[PDB]
Each structure stands twice: as structure tokens, then as C-alpha cells.
């Protein structure tokens, strides 16, 4: 079929992917790949570990081997390029099989949020404020069979905790979340804002929080941004984060000057 | 000697301490303490007396200027003696045993229970000296749990105060410098966890300078700092590395000799392996990272084509060194080490794929690597000692098969104890503190 033709990576594809490819190249390359079946668990597979960097805006591949194990009571994974050998990692595939575009989009979103939160935590540390919220890193595994893509999986470190909405340390989780949204607005040259008030709380409710399902409003529209753009921005500053908190001030975050779009 | 039983025994010790906390001070207790402190081997008794005498801020390692084996051998007896000395109220001997088992139990990832019993001892007798190593362990676990401010408090307190901690009594200034260097290294790790790559590298360089200021350089600390520095170089951006290269206060040969953060990271990995030449697991970890750095560089647009194959051959050597850290029929027990062996095998297979195309030997080695991966997962999933030994054996048999297939030949080092070629120790010599503090 022509789908099988598109799913096969040539030496040139491998060379580009190992050197690092732009978003547009990657997305156009995997256009006629269709939708795959669930990867086969209890098995070792050759694969490409793909990682996205917002700083460089690059997708980079490494050859690896992954073992896919049992579902979590999501399924355990273990490949040869993990950051933590003794650590545990979970992989996940959409229950309804989807295309590669969705996996890559979700990962780009997670890693943009993570970039902003990393800069946020740098600023916090410089100001002697404990780091409280983080983003789980996310990577892609292209499961290959004879140089042919036969699966796509998302990979994350395992986090043991409970899902919360940040409703109910020194500051409330809500204050961290909203201050981080404001920071994303400023640091992004007033072009992005990450809004998410839900995630995995760890350590009997005392420990760190790993945020999930982030929503990124932006004027520079990308595959992973929301449908609202400046609207969303305005909403966040006029309904969600109406007045700043201590964290915003200690970071020297100023109030935006906006007009309700539309 | 399983993490869980040892954790339960440490919880029992801490509960005994909580109990004694509510009571007043029997001859049976001191009899039991003497019995448990006499049942042990004389080496462990000498180590206990040296720790009680505070002759070192850290427990020495063979080849730093085995310990792990003798500690693991008498771990049960050492913990029994610990709880015995606890009943006898000789908190000094209990603290000495804590100092002696601290590093091993960090390896077993139960430092929390040990620090709990340490704080209980301090509660029973606040004057009891506790080794700087244990306080640094508290700082380490604070870093790992994400309490960066608490860890920094502890580390800056130990740095500014010339290593001073509690009622501990140093015996020379070199030990104070060594403690300061370890603390600066952990501060570099703190900044690394936050992604502040440049400042992290600066603190790691300061730790290296401190290590080299000792009368006998700390080769273990140097290997550690250089591995951290390799990781930082990998994580850095071109601009971070350009800025760290042109810093005058940073006189490093690997900087002024390499113009790419991945090549510098690979060189630093070579140095770290050399500095732990007599410890094969650290050699394997460092050379796996070196091969990964070289695989990434040779695959990048920054690598001159004329040089690509050359860097691949470097990767080749790297992985070969890792695979040579063990011999046929030589048992492997750790999960990290088994993983690292599968990693090295697949990295060498990948180097052969990058150099030679889809050959039959490359395909056979890939298949063997997948089989080893399956066995390794089943090893990390099993929970029986015999099942895990058989699985380690099967994994290492597959690794030996990959070595055969890819024609890995040993190197000859005049030092029959070194796990690295002489081309690493060669670089070691020319690597390049008070003003830095
Ligand atoms: N080559 C090498 C060695 C160790 N590691 C890793 O470092 C951490 C911590 O090591 P530790 O042995 O558990 O810490 P100690 O305080 O008990 O010993 C001191 O360690 C430092 C330095 O090597 C590490 O901080 C020395 O300078 C001191 O003299 C003491 O020996 C371990 O997880 C270990 O895996 C490493 O990566 N590489
Ligand atoms: Zn604000």
C-alpha cells in the first residue's frame, strides 16, 4: 500500500532524524502513515527515541531498544536511553489508535510547558522560594520492524501520587500555578501563557506536584496551542489570575495592558 | 542483606532509640554489647575504633589515593552490634558503625532509616560526634527529594565553616579541604538539577581544583566530578559551552582542546573512567556515556564528514572498553551493571551499523541485544535470588556472544588491575582553591 511505503525509513531519513529535524520536516515526512495498532507488549523492540527541545525547537532521534511490559493497575517500559537506569518509566498509547501527529503535538506541548517551568524554577531558586511544581518530561518511541515504523508510544518517568485540581508549603499550589502562568506570559515576550491547575501531587500530599493537561494560549499559533489565542490570554489575566500574589512580585512580573478581543 | 530486611532492622534500631528516650539507664546490656562487638572480624573492629577516633571525615576506599566487600560481608553483624551498643548507651560506637555502613546503605537506598537512627542517637546524647559524611548524606537525600534550600543550607554551612560540624574533630587541613570540595560538588549537582548548566559547571570545576589541592588527589572524587561535568557539557547549549570555554579562571585542557560540548563531554568521560580505573562499574558507566556522546556527535551536522568515521571508531573503543570490564563466566549481580552491559553491547552494535551497513553480523548482534533486553527485563521483574542469578548468567552469556560476533579484542595494560587502556591514563596527568571559596 502507499502507507507501508511512507512508514519505511530510508538511510536518508535516519541520517536526518539522528542529526535533528525541524517540526515541519518531521510532520510532513510522516503524513501518509495513517494509524497504527497497539504496540505488542511483553516484548523487546528496536526503536527510535525522539526528543523535542523548545530551546532549539528540534526533534532528535537516537537508536535504542525498548522492552514493553505489563499495563499499570499505561504500561511499564524500559529502554536503553533512560535518564535513570534504576528508575521506572511508563509508556502510553491512545486507547483509540491515532496518528503520529497527535503524539508529537502532545510531546511538544509538554516540553514547552516544561521549558517555561524550568526557567520559572530557576527564578524561584534565585529568590529563595522552594520549587514546588514541575512538568514530567515526555519522549517519543517509534517502534520499528525492519526499518518500518509499526508503532508510536509516549514515554514518561513513573510518578506515584494522586490527581488534584490545586483547589483543596509557603504558598498555595494555586499561587504557584498562576504565578507560573504569568511568568510564561512575560518570559515568552507576551506571546504565550500556560494555564493548568491540575496534576499529580506526591508524598502523602506534602510533596512536589507534576502538572498535567497543560493549556497553552498564544498569538503565535502552533499545532499544540489552544483555539483561543489572545482571547485565552485575556481570560487568564481578567478572570483566572485577577490579582497577583507574592511570587509574581518577587519575580518582578508586571500587569499586562490588554483589551477583551473579538 | 536485602534492602527490605535491612530497612526493617534499621527501623527496629530507631524504635529502640525512641524507647530508650523515655527511660533511665543493666550489666546484661554491656555484656550483649561486648559480645556483639567481639563476634565481628578484626578488620571491622579496627574500622570501628578508627571511626570512633574520627581519623577521617569519610571512610577510605581502596584505590582512592575492598571496603564494599568487607562491609557487605559483616553488614548483619555490624547492624547487630549497632543495636547492641544502642542498648548499652555507647552512642559513640553506634555512631561509628553508622559512619561505617553509611556509604553501603546509600547504595542500598535506605539512607533514610540510617539517618533516622543517627538523629535518634544525637537525641540520646547530643555530644556524640557524627561524621561529616553522614551530614553530607542528609544533604544528598535533601537534594534527591527536591529540598534544594535545606541541602544548600547544610552544604554552605559546612563550606563556610571549613568543614566544621557538630562535635567532630578534624586531624588536618587536607580533610577540611576535601569536605569543602565534596560539598561544592554537591552544590554543582544542585544547580545541575535546576538546569543552570554554566554555574553548575563552575562549581564542578571548583570541586576539581579542590580535589587536586590535596597532598594525594582524591581520584574517586575526581572521577565523580568529571562525570558530572560530562553530563553538564552534554546538557549545555552551544552558547553555555562557548561561555565556559572562554572563562579565564577555568584552566581545563579538555576545553582549550575541543570546540564542541559533546567532544568535551566525551573527553571528560574518558578522564572519569581513568580516575576510576580499578572499579569496573564506574568505567562501564563513563564509557557508555562517552560512546553515546560520540554517536551523537558523529551523527550531527557539526561533525566534519572527514572525521565522522574517526569519531565512530572512538565510540567503538568506548563501548569495547565497557564490554571488556567483565569476562566469560564472571558473575554480575547489579541491575544497573546488567543494564549498562546491554547498553554497551547495543552501542557497539550501533557503531558497527553506522560504520558497516545492514550486514549479517550486525543483524545477529541486534537480535542478541534484543534477547538480552528481554532477559534483563525479566531480571528486573523477578524477586528470587536463584532466578535472578540464572537471569544474570543468561544476560552475560548473550553479552559474551555479542563480544564474539563483533570481534572484541582485549587491550594489554601494564597495570594488570586497570580496566581502561593506557591512552586514558596518558591524558590524566595534564588535567590543568582558597581563592575559589
Ligand atoms: N567514581 C564515582 C564515585 C561515586 N559516584 C557516585 O557518587 C555518589 C556518592 O558517592 P558516595 O561514596 O556514596 O559518597 P561518600 O560521602 O560516602 O564518599 C565520598 O564520595 C566523594 C565523591 O566521590 C562523591 O561525592 C569523595 O570525594 C569522598 O572522598 C568520599 O569518598 C554514589 O552514588 C556514587 O554512585 C560516582 O558516580 N562516581
Ligand atoms: Zn501575577
Swiss-Prot record, chain A:
Domain of life of the organism encoding this protein: Eukaryota
All copies of domain Alpha-type protein kinase, residue ranges: 51-256
UniProt note on tissues of expression: Highly expressed in liver. Expressed in the optic nerve and retinal pigmented epithelium. Lower expression is observed in the macula and extramacular retina.
GO molecular function: ATP binding; monosaccharide binding; protein serine kinase activity; protein serine/threonine kinase activity
A cellular component term, taken from the record's GO annotations: ciliary basal body
GO biological process: cilium assembly; cytoplasmic pattern recognition receptor signaling pathway; innate immune response; positive regulation of canonical NF-kappaB signal transduction
UniProt entry keywords in alphabetical sequence: Cell projection, Cilium biogenesis/degradation, Cytoplasm, Cytoskeleton, Disease variant, Immunity, Innate immunity, Kinase, Serine/threonine-protein kinase, Transferase
Protein location: Cytoplasm, Cytosol; Cytoplasm, Cytoskeleton, Spindle pole; Cytoplasm, Cytoskeleton, Microtubule organizing center, Centrosome; Cell projection, Cilium
Purpose: Serine/threonine-protein kinase that detects bacterial pathogen-associated molecular pattern metabolites (PAMPs) and initiates an innate immune response, a critical step for pathogen elimination and engagement of adaptive immunity. Specifically recognizes and binds ADP-D-glycero-beta-D-manno-heptose (ADP-Heptose), a potent PAMP present in all Gram-negative and some Gram-positive bacteria. ADP-Heptose-binding stimulates its kinase activity to phosphorylate and activate TIFA, triggering pro-inflammatory NF-kappa-B signaling.
Similarity comment: Belongs to the protein kinase superfamily. Alpha-type protein kinase family. ALPK subfamily.
Disorder association: Retinal dystrophy, optic nerve edema, splenomegaly, anhidrosis, and migraine headache syndrome: An autosomal dominant disorder characterized by decreased vision associated with optic nerve edema, evident in childhood. Low-grade ocular inflammation is common in affected individuals. Later in childhood or the second decade of life, patients have increasing visual impairment, abnormal cone function and loss of rod function. By the third decade of life, visual acuity ranges from counting fingers to no light perception.
Name of the protein: Alpha-protein kinase 1
UniProt source species: Homo sapiens
Residues of the full protein shown: 967 to 1243 of 1244
Swiss-Prot record, chain B:
Keyword Kinase: yes
Top-level lineage group: Eukaryota
UniProt keyword terms in alphabetical order: Cell projection, Cilium biogenesis/degradation, Cytoplasm, Cytoskeleton, Disease variant, Immunity, Innate immunity, Kinase, Serine/threonine-protein kinase, Transferase
Sites where the protein binds ADP-D-glycero-beta-D-manno-heptose: 58, 64, 103, 137-140, 218, 220, 223-224, 282
GO biological process: cilium assembly; cytoplasmic pattern recognition receptor signaling pathway; innate immune response; positive regulation of canonical NF-kappaB signal transduction
Consequence of substituting residue 64 to A: Impaired ADP-D-glycero-beta-D-manno-heptose-binding and ability to activate the serine/threonine-protein kinase activity
GO CC aspect terms: centrosome; ciliary basal body; cilium; cytosol; spindle pole
Effect of residue 218 to A: Impaired ADP-D-glycero-beta-D-manno-heptose-binding and ability to activate the serine/threonine-protein kinase activity
Effect of residue 103 to A: Impaired ADP-D-glycero-beta-D-manno-heptose-binding and ability to activate the serine/threonine-protein kinase activity
Tissue: Highly expressed in liver. Expressed in the optic nerve and retinal pigmented epithelium. Lower expression is observed in the macula and extramacular retina.
Keyword presence, Transferase: yes
Subcellular location: Cytoplasm, Cytosol; Cytoplasm, Cytoskeleton, Spindle pole; Cytoplasm, Cytoskeleton, Microtubule organizing center, Centrosome; Cell projection, Cilium
GO molecular function list: ATP binding; monosaccharide binding; protein serine kinase activity; protein serine/threonine kinase activity
Function, in words: Serine/threonine-protein kinase that detects bacterial pathogen-associated molecular pattern metabolites (PAMPs) and initiates an innate immune response, a critical step for pathogen elimination and engagement of adaptive immunity. Specifically recognizes and binds ADP-D-glycero-beta-D-manno-heptose (ADP-Heptose), a potent PAMP present in all Gram-negative and some Gram-positive bacteria. ADP-Heptose-binding stimulates its kinase activity to phosphorylate and activate TIFA, triggering pro-inflammatory NF-kappa-B signaling.
Disease cited in the entry: Retinal dystrophy, optic nerve edema, splenomegaly, anhidrosis, and migraine headache syndrome: An autosomal dominant disorder characterized by decreased vision associated with optic nerve edema, evident in childhood. Low-grade ocular inflammation is common in affected individuals. Later in childhood or the second decade of life, patients have increasing visual impairment, abnormal cone function and loss of rod function. By the third decade of life, visual acuity ranges from counting fingers to no light perception.
Family, as annotated: Belongs to the protein kinase superfamily. Alpha-type protein kinase family. ALPK subfamily.
Protein name, as recorded: Alpha-protein kinase 1
Gene source species: Homo sapiens
Section covered of the full-length record: 2 to 456 of 1244
Amino acid at each position: 500500500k502507499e502507507i507501508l511505503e511512507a512508514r519505511t525509513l530510508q538511510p536518508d531519513d535516519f541520517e536526518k532524524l539522528l542529526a535533528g529535524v525541524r517540526h515541519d520536516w518531521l510532520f510532513q515526512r510522516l503524513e501518509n502513515t495513517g494509524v497504527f495498532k497497539p504496540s505488542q507488549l511483553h516484548r523487546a523492540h528496536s526503536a527510535l527515541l525522539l526528543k523535542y527541545s523548545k530551546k532549539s525547537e528540534l526533534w532528535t532521534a537516537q537508536e535504542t531498544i525498548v522492552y514493553l511490559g505489563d499495563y499499570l493497575t499505561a504500561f511499564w517500559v524500559h529502554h536503553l536511553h533512560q535518564e535513570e537506569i534504576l528508575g521506572r518509566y511508563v509508556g502510553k498509547d491512545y486507547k483509540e489508535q491515532k496518528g503520529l501527529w497527535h503524539h508529537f503535538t502532545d510531546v511538544e506541548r509538554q516540553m514547552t510547558a516544561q521549558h517555561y517551568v524550568t526557567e520559572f524554577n530557576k527564578r524561584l531558586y534565585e529568590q529563595n522560594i522552594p520549587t514546588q511544581i514541575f512538568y514530567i518530561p515526555s519522549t517519543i518511541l517509534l517502534i520499528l520492524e525492519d526499518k518500518t515504523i509499526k508503532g508510536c508510544i509516549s514515554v514518561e518517568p513513573y510518578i506515584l501520587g494522586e490527581f488534584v485540581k490545586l483547589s483543596n508549603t509557603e504558598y498555595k499550589a494555586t499561587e504557584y500555578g498562576l504565578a507560573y502562568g504569568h511568568f510564561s506570559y512575560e518570559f515568552s515576550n507576551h506571546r504565550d501563557v500556560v494555564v493548568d491547575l491540575q496534576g499529580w501531587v506526591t508524598g502523602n500530599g506534602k510533596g512536589l506536584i507534576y502538572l498535567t493537561d497543560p493549556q497553552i494560549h498564544s498569538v503565535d499559533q502552533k499545532v499544540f496551542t489552544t483555539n483561543f489565542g489572545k482571547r485565552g490570554i485575556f481570560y487568564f489575566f481578567n478572570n483566572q489570575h485577577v490579582e497577583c500574589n507574592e511570587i509574581c512580585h518577587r519575580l518582578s512580573l508586571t500587569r499586562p495592558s490588554m483589551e477583551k478581543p473579538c | 542483606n536485602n534492602q527490605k530486611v535491612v530497612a526493617v532492622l534499621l527501623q527496629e534500631c530507631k524504635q529502640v532509640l525512641d524507647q530508650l528516650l523515655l527511660e533511665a539507664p543493666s550489666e546484661e546490656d554491656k555484656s550483649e554489647d561486648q559480645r556483639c562487638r567481639a563476634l565481628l572480624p578484626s578488620e571491622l573492629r579496627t574500622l570501628i575504633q578508627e571511626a570512633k577516633e574520627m581519623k577521617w571525615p569519610f571512610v577510605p576506599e581502596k584505590w582512592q589515593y575492598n571496603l564494599k566487600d568487607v562491609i557487605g560481608a559483616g553488614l548483619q553483624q555490624l547492624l547487630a552490634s549497632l543495636r547492641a551498643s544502642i542498648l548499652a548507651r555507647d552512642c559513640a560506637a553506634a555512631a561509628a558503625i553508622v559512619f561505617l555502613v553509611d556509604r553501603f546503605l546509600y547504595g542500598l537506598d535506605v539512607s533514610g532509616k540510617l539517618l533516622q537512627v543517627a538523629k535518634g542517637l544525637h537525641k540520646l546524647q547530643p555530644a556524640t560526634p557524627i561524621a561529616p559524611q553522614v551530614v553530607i548524606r542528609q544533604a544528598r537525600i535533601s537534594v534527591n527529594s527536591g529540598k534544594l534550600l535545606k541541602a544548600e543550607y547544610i552544604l554552605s554551612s559546612l563550606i563556610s565553616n571549613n568543614g566544621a560540624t557538630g562535635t567532630w574533630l578534624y586531624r588536618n587541613e587536607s580533610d577540611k579541604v576535601l569536605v569543602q570540595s565534596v560539598c561544592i560538588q554537591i552544590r554543582g549537582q544542585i544547580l545541575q538539577k535546576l538546569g543552570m548548566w554554566y554555574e553548575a559547571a563552575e562549581l564542578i570545576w571548583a570541586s576539581i581544583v579542590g580535589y587536586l589541592a590535596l597532598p594525594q588527589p582524591d581520584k574517586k572524587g575526581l572521577s565523580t566530578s568529571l562525570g558530572i561535568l560530562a553530563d553538564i557539557f552534554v546538557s549545555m547549549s552551544k552558547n553555555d559551552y562557548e561561555k565556559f570555554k572562554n572563562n579565564p579562571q577555568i584552566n581545563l585542557s579538555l576545553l582549550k582542546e575541543f570546540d564542541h560540548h559533546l567532544l568535551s563531554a566525551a573527553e571528560a568521560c574518558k578522564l572519569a573512567a581513568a580516575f576510576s580505573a580499578y572499579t569496573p562499574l564506574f568505567v562501564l558507566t563513563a564509557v557508555n556515556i562517552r560512546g553515546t556522546c560520540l554517536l551523537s556527535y558523529s551523527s550531527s551536522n557539526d561533525c566534519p564528514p572527514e572525521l565522522k568515521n574517526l569519531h565512530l571508531c572512538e565510540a567503538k573503543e568506548a563501548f569495547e572498553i565497557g564490554l571488556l570490564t567483565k569476562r566469560d563466566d564472571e558473575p554480575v549481580t547489579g541491575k544497573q551493571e546488567l543494564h549498562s552491559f546491554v547498553k554497551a553491547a547495543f552501542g557497539l552494535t550501533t557503531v558497527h551499523r553506522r560504520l558497516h551497513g545492514e550486514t549479517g553480523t550486525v543483524h545477529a548482534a541486534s537480535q542478541l541485544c534484543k534477547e538480552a533486553m528481554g532477559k534483563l527485563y525479566n531480571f528486573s521483574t523477578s524477586s528470587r535470588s536463584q532466578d535472578r542469578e540464572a537471569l544474570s548468567q543468561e544476560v552475560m552469556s548473550v553479552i559474551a556472544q555479542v563480544k564474539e560476533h563483533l570481534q572484541v579484542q582485549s587491550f594489554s595494560n601494564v597495570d594488570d588491575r586497570s580496566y581502561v587502556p593506557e591512552s586514558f591514563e596518558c591524558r590524566l596527568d595534564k588535567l590543568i582553591f582558597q581563592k575559589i571559596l
